[PDB]
C-alpha cells in the first residue's frame, strides 16, 4: 500500500509497459563501444544515436539509466527484436531476479541493494541485462552504480574485458553485482556485531524493535539472493551457444560466490535468531533475579513479622512475662532464625 | 593499491625457513636461516620440501616465489592472511591456501593461521605465519622413513600435507566436542548469565570453523575430480579419500551447530525451572504464614466482650491451632507435589 507492493499491472495485457517503480526523475544513455584495439564512450540522451551499435560485431555496452521513459525502452526492444514479456519484466521492479535463454538474446534480471546507516532500510534497484551476441543492453532506474570498477576496466586496458567479447562483459557486470553483495554483507555484518554487543551488554526495550527490523531486512535480502543461486546455475548448466565456452569457468566462479553469499545470509539469519533467544534468556534471568531478591526479603522478614504479631497479643496469664527485666526475650529468636535462613539461602545459591 | 604485495596478518615474530630433500633411498635435512642455499633444490630430480615458516619478511617470500616461478599475484595471495581456502591450477605449479586452527582452551579462543602450498612436480613449498605447525606425522614419516612417502613423488607429499591438516581438523573437532560437553554439564546444573556469552562464543567459533571448512570441500573436489596434470593419476584416490574425510568433518560441524542451537533452549528451560524453585519457596512460606496470621492477628483486636482471657491455656491453645493449621498447609502442599 506504500508502492512497495505489487498492485502494478492488475488485469492489463502482458504487452503493457506500466512502469512499476517510482524513481522517475532522471534519464540518460551511457555507451561504451570497446573493441580489441578500439574504445568509444559517450553520455548521450537521444535514443536514435545508439542504434547503429546493434549490428556492429564489436562488443558494445549500452547502459540506459532511467526506464520510466517508456518510449525509449519500447523503441529499444522493438529495434532489438526483444519479446514484449521481456519488456514487461524490464519495467516491473517488483520482479524476482531471473534468467531467460532465448534464440537471439539472453535476458537476466538482478537487484542492486544499497543500505543506509542508523535507520535500517535496505533499498532495492532493479537492473536488467540483455545480451545480443554483439551488444549488452543494461537497464537501470537511477544513477548510482556498482559498475565503476568495470567502467575503469574498459576505460583503461586492464584485465581481460578489453579483449574478450560481450559474454565476458556480462560476466563482469554480474561479478560487479556479486561484489556489491559482498560489501553489503560486510555492512550488515557490522550491524549484526553492534546488535550482538547491545544484546549481550545493555538489553533494552528498543532492542526488540532493532532485532525484528533487522530480521525483516535479512529475510527480504534472502528473498532476493536465493533466486541468484538458480540464476547462476542456469547460466552455467545447459549453456546456450550464445555464451562462449571459454567464459564458462568465470560463471562457475560467480556461481560459487553466489553460494557463498547464500551461506552468509543463512548464517546471519541463524545469528539473528540466536540474538533474539539470548534476549529472551536475559529477560528470564532478570525475572529470576528479581524474584530471588523478593522471596529472600519475603522469607527472612515475613516470618519475623509473624512472630512479632503472635508474641504481641491482647491476652493475659501468658507465659511471656517480663521475667527477663528487659523485653527482648524474642528478638534473639528473630536474629537466630534470620541468620539460619540467610545461611540456608546462601548455600542454596540464592543471592 | 592495485595488485600490491604486502603482508596483511598480525603474527610478526620470526622465521625459520627449513627444507627436507627426501628421495627413494636417501634423504637430507638442511634447515637454515638464509634465503639462499635452498633455491638449488628447484631443479633436483628428487622431490624436495621447503618450509617458509614465517612470511613476515617479504624479502624471502618474494625471492623464493619469483625464483621458483611463482607469479607475483600468487605471492600476494600467500601474503594475504584473510583469504579462504583456495585452489588454483597453473601450467607448472598448483597453488593451495589452507587454514589451520589453534584453540586457547583456558580462555576459549579459536585462532587461525594460513598455510600456503605450492606444488611444482619437483618441490613442495609451504609458507606459514607462525613458528611451529601441525606436521609432525608427515615429518616423522619422512625422517624415520616410516611411511611409503619416499617413492611416490611430490604428489604424495602434497597429499600428506593435506592429510595432516585434515587430522588437525579432526583433533580440533574433538576439542570442540570436549568444550561442548563441558558447557553442557556446566549448564542445567549451574545456570548463569555468563553461560549465555559462553554459548554465543562457541557458536561464533563454530560459524568461523564452518566458514573455513566449506571451501575445503570444494578445494578437495577440485583436487581429485579435475585431476590437474601436476598431480599424477595414481594419487587421485588418495585425494578422494581426503574429500570423504572433509565431508565427514562438515557433517560433524553441522551437527555441532545444531546442538549448540538447542543448548540455549535447554538453558532457558533450566532457568525456568530454577525460578520455579524460588517460586515454590515463596508460595509455601506465604501459604503457611499468611493464612496463619489471622488467629495471631484476629487476636490483637483491642476489643472487649470475648473469651479473650477466659480459656484453659488460651495462648497455648492458639499455639496448638497454629501448629494444626501449619501442618495442615504443609500436608496440603506435600501430598500433591507443590515443591
Amino acid at each position, epitope marked *: 500500500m506504500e508502492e512497495k507492493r505489487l498492485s502494478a499491472k492488475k488485469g492489463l495485457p502482458p504487452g503493457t509497459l506500466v512502469y512499476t517503480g517510482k524513481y522517475r526523475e532522471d534519464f540518460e544513455i551511457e555507451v561504451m563501444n570497446y573493441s580489441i584495439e578500439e574504445f568509444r564512450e559517450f553520455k548521450t540522451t537521444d535514443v536514435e544515436s545508439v542504434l547503429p551499435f546493434r549490428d556492429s560485431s564489436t562488443p558494445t555496452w549500452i547502459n540506459i539509466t532511467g526506464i520510466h521513459r517508456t518510449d525509449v525502452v519500447q523503441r529499444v526492444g522493438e529495434f532489438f527484436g526483444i519479446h514484449p514479456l521481456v519488456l514487461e519484466d524490464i519495467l516491473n521492479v517488483h520482479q524476482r531476479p531471473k534468467v531467460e535463454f532465448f534464440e537471439n538474446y539472453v535476458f537476466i534480471v538482478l537487484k542492486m541493494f544499497t543500505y543506509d546507516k542508523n535507520l535500517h532500510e535496505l533499498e532495492s534497484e532493479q537492473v536488467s541485462l540483455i545480451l545480443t551476441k554483439n551488444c549488452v543492453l543494461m537497464f537501470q532506474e537511477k544513477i548510482g552504480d556498482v559498475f565503476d570498477p568495470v567502467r575503469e576496466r574498459i576505460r583503461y586496458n586492464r584485465g581481460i574485458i578489453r579483449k574478450k567479447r560481450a559474454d565476458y562483459l556480462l560476466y563482469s557486470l554480474i561479478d560487479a553485482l556479486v561484489d556489491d553483495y559482498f560489501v553489503l554483507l560486510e555492512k550488515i555484518d557490522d550491524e549484526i556485531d553492534v546488535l550482538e554487543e547491545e544484546v549481550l551488554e545493555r538489553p533494552e526495550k528498543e532492542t526488540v524493535q532493532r532485532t525484528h527490523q533487522l530480521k525483516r531486512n535479512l529475510v527480504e535480502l534472502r528473498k532476493t539472493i536465493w533466486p541468484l543461486r538458480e540464476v547462476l546455475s542456469s547460466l552455467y548448466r545447459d549453456v546456450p551457444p550464445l555464451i562462449e565456452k571459454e567464459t564458462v569457468p568465470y560463471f562457475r566462479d560467480v556461481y560459487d560466490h553466489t553460494i557463498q553469499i547464500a551461506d552468509t545470509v543463512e548464517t546471519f539469519r541463524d545469528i539473528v535468531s540466536g540474538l533474539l533467544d539470548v534476549y529472551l534468556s536475559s529477560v528470564s534471568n532478570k525475572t529470576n533475579e528479581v524474584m530471588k531478591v523478593l522471596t529472600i526479603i519475603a522469607t527472612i522478614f515475613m516470618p519475623l513479622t509473624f512472630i512479632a504479631g503472635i508474641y504481641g497479643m491482647n491476652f493475659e496469664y501468658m507465659p511471656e512475662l517480663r521475667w527477663k527485666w528487659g523485653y527482648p526475650v524474642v528478638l534473639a529468636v528473630m536474629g537466630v532464625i534470620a541468620v539460619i535462613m540467610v545461611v540456608y539461602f546462601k548455600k542454596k545459591k540464592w543471592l | 593499491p592495485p595488485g600490491t*604485495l604486502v603482508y596483511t596478518g598480525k603474527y610478526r615474530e620470526d622465521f625459520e625457513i627449513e627444507v627436507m630433500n627426501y628421495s627413494i633411498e636417501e634423504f637430507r635435512e638442511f634447515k637454515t636461516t638464509d634465503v639462499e642455499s635452498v633455491l638449488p633444490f628447484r631443479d633436483s630430480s628428487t622431490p624436495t620440501w621447503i618450509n617458509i615458516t614465517g612470511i613476515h619478511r617479504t624479502d624471502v617470500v618474494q625471492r623464493v616465489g619469483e625464483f621458483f*616461478g611463482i607469479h607475483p599475484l600468487v605471492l600476494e595471495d600467500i601474503l594475504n592472511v584473510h583469504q579462504r581456502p583456495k585452489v588454483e591450477f597453473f601450467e607448472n605449479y598448483v597453488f593451495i591456501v589452507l587454514k589451520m586452527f589453534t584453540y586457547d582452551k583456558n580462555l576459549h579462543e579459536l585462532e587461525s593461521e594460513q598455510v600456503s602450498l605450492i606444488l611444482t612436480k619437483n618441490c613442495v613449498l609451504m609458507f606459514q605465519e607462525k613458528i611451529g605447525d601441525v606436521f609432525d606425522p608427515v615429518r616423522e614419516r619422512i625422517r624415520y622413513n616410516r611411511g611409503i612417502i619416499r617413492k611416490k613423488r611430490a604428489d604424495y607429499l602434497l597429499y600428506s600435507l593435506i592429510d595432516a591438516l585434515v587430522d588437525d581438523y579432526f583433533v580440533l573437532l574433538e576439542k570442540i566436542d570436549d568444550e561442548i560437553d563441558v558447557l553442557e554439564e556446566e549448564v542445567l546444573e549451574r545456570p548463569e548469565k555468563e553461560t549465555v556469552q559462553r554459548t554465543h562464543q562457541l557458536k561464533r567459533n563454530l560459524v568461523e570453523l564452518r566458514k573455513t571448512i566449506w571451501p575445503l570441500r570444494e578445494v578437495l573436489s577440485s583436487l581429485y575430480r579435475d585431476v590437474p596434470p601436476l598431480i599424477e593419476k595414481e594419487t587421485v584416490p588418495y585425494f578422494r579419500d581426503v574429500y570423504d574425510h572433509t565431508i565427514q568433518i562438515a557433517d560433524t560441524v553441522e551437527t555441532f551447530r545444531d546442538i549448540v542451537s538447542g543448548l540455549l533452549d535447554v538453558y532457558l528451560s533450566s532457568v525456568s525451572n530454577k525460578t520455579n524453585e524460588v517460586m515454590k519457596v515463596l508460595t509455601i512460606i506465604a501459604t503457611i504464614f499468611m493464612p496463619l496470621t489471622f488467629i495471631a492477628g484476629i487476636y490483637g483486636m483491642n476489643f472487649e466482650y470475648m473469651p479473650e482471657l477466659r480459656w484453659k491455656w488460651g495462648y497455648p491453645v492458639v499455639l496448638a491451632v497454629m501448629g494444626v493449621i501449619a501442618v495442615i498447609m504443609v500436608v496440603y502442599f506435600k501430598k500433591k507435589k507443590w515443591l
Partner: antibody
Amino acid sequence: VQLVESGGGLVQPGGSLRLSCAASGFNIYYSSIHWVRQAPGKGLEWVASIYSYSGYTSYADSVKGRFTISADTSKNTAYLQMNSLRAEDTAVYYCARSFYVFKRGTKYPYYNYPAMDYWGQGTLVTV
Amino acid sequence: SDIQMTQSPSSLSASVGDRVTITCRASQSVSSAVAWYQQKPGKAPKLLIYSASSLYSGVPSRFSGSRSGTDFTLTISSLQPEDFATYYCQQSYYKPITFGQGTKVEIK
C-alpha cells in the same frame, strides 16, 4: 608514460656512478622498474630490478651483491648507484617499467608474467 | 642456476613482403612468459609481443606469436623496409630473466 635517463659518460675502472631514470605518467611506489644493459655490438642482458612498494631489489647473478639500486617516490625517479666498477660494465643502460595484465577468480586464473612496455631513452657508460 | 634461453637464427635475410619466422627455446619450460622485443640501432627497443600470444597496443597486426610448449615462434607476415631491426626473445617466468642472443635482419 615517459622514462628519461641521465648520467652518461666515462669513468675510471673501480669508480662510482649514479644513474637516474625519471618517470612521468605513473606512480613508482606501487610499481616495478628494471635496468638492463646492452654491451656495444653485443646482446642485451638484465641487470637489476626494483619493486619499490616493499623496497625490494634484485641483482643479476653476474653482478650480484656489487650494485646498488632503489627508488624515490617523492620525485618518482628510480636511482641506481653503480659501484665496484668492472671493465665489462661499459654498455648502454635502459630503464624500463614492467607491467602485467591479470584476472583473478577463475578456477584456472589467467595471469601474465611481467614484460616491459615503456623503455628509457638510454645512457652510455664507458670504463 | 641460470636459464639458457636461445634464439635463432643469429641473423637472417628476408625481402619485403615475406613471412619470416624467429624461433626461441628455453632449457626449462617457462610457460607463456616469453616476450618478443624489437630494437632498431638508434632507437630504445620496443615491446612487440608479450606472453607470446597477446599483441601490444600500437603494434600493427602484422606481427604474431605462437606456442609449442618449450618452443616459441614469432612470425611476421609481410616485412616492410622500415621495420628492419634486431628482435630479442625475453623470458620472465624465472626472476633472473634472460634475453635471446639476437636476430638482426636487414633489407635484402
